[PDB]
Paper text:
Only a few parasite proteins are exposed on host cell surfaces, and these have mostly diversified into large protein families, allowing a population survival strategy based on antigenic variation. More ubiquitous across Plasmodium species are families of small variant surface antigens (VSAs). These include the CIRs of Plasmodium chabaudi and the VIRs of Plasmodium vivax, often known as the “Plasmodium-interspersed repeats” (PIRs). To determine the structure of a member of the PIR family, we focused on proteins from P. chabaudi, often known as CIRs. These consist of an N-terminal extracellular domain ranging in size from 28 kDa (236 residues) to 133 kDa (1,331 residues) in the AS strain.
Residue numbers in the entry: 5 to 242
């Protein structure tokens, strides 16, 4: 679905607002953006004192926003799985950026900082479901199974998000869509080659739908205001 239009927008919004000194992607458009999701401090309302508090609140804000993409905020099993995967991919990227954190500390960070935030159980609809915990655990395990490629894979996802942002502003006149799609497929082919990615690996097959569905939707949307022959997404290392 055209879900990446919103996912890419929401991730950019939370990135600029993370307020963490060591991580800088931009200026916060709204200082109160995730304040509603800050963890409690000594039984009192949270203000987000630590970097872990801000990441935790930012992650919950993401999940809450992604669920809004579903009709009536009622996500199917497939939507819950897809949105948990996007949020946990972003979380892996953040932990990889943070010094003294990483994909190796992701499971620990989730249990000690996300499940620990009182706003996770009350605002994320599926938080208490055992089916949801299984989805989250699988996504965390997938990040660990692919830990060596996850930071570079995220850069490819970011390049895909840049095309979605361009389409969002140009609307029916994204004249550079074909040129950008060709640069994207070449950049992705280089990612497979440089990292010796076996696209038939079980773990890689479960993160690949983020790019394969995302790219397929993007070129279908560009071909709504133009008429171009877009290159197919690379299938293997070359």
């Amino acid at each position: 679905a055209d879900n990446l239009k919103y996912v890419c927008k929401d991730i950019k919004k939370i990135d600029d607002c993370l307020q963490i000194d060591t991580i800088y992607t931009g200026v916060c458009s709204d200082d109160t953006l995730y304040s509603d999701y800050c963890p409690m401090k000594n039984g009192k309302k949270g203000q987000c004192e630590t970097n872990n508090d801000k990441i935790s609140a930012g992650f919950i804000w993401l999940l809450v926003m992604f669920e809004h993409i579903c009709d009536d905020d009622e996500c199917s099993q497939n939507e819950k799985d897809q949105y948990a995967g996007y949020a946990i991919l972003w979380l892996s990227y953040i932990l990889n950026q943070m010094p003294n954190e990483g994909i190796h500390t992701l499971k620990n960070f989730y249990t000690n900082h996300i499940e620990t935030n009182t706003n996770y159980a009350s605002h994320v609809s599926s938080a208490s479901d055992s089916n949801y915990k299984g989805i989250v655990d699988k996504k965390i395990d997938l990040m660990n199974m692919n830990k060596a490629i996850i930071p570079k894979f995220y850069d490819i996802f970011k390049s895909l998000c840049n095309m979605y942002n361009e389409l969002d502003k140009n609307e029916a006149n994204y004249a550079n869509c074909l040129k950008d799609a060709q640069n994207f497929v070449d950049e992705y082919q280089k990612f497979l080659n440089d990292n010796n990615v076996d696209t038939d690996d079980s773990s890689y097959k479960q993160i690949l739908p983020i790019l394969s569905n995302g790219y397929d939707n993007l070129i279908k949307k560009c071909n709504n205001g133009q008429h171009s022959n877009f290159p197919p997404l690379p299938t293997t290392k070359t």
